[PDB]
Structure formats: C-alpha cells, structure tokens
C-alpha cells in the first residue's frame, strides 16, 4: 500500500454483500456459479489404450 503503489496485489479480493432476502442455500449455489472450474476437477480417470 504505502510503498510501491502496487496495481498487482498478491491476493486481490472483493467483498460482495448479499441481500437480506437471499438465503444461505441460495448463496452457496451462487458462489458455485462464479468460481472457475477446471475440467480436471470433474475427471475421475483418463484411461489411454
């Protein structure tokens, strides 16, 4: 912050307030709609013959 005035922070974050009518089950479904999903994450095996 004080030195270097870095536009490239190591861990840039963003805090998102959710509404007062949206629930926790609706919000956990919502976090999945944003997060990056590699194709690696859904693969159990790759068998190559």
Partner DNA sequence: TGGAGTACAAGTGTGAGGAAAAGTAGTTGGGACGAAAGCAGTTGAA
Q: Which is nearer to DNA, 4 or 15 (CB)?
A: 4
CB of 15 vs DNA, minimal distance in Å: 23
* C-alpha triplet 38, 42, 45: angle, nearest 5°: 115
- Detail the DSSP E strand segments found in 1-49: none
Binders of DNA in range 1-40 (CB under 7 A): 4-8
In the complex with DNA, the residue whose CB is nearer, 3 or 16, is 3
Phi and psi at 13, nearest 5°, equal -130, 175
Residues that bind DNA in the complex, under the rule CB under 7 A: 4-8
């Amino acid at each position: 912050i004080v030195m270097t005035a870095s536009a490239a922070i190591k861990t840039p974050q963003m805090t998102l307030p959710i509404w007062n009518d949206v629930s926790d089950e609706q919000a956990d479904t919502f976090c999945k709609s944003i997060s990056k999903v590699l194709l690696s994450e859904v693969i159990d095996k790759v068998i190559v013959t």
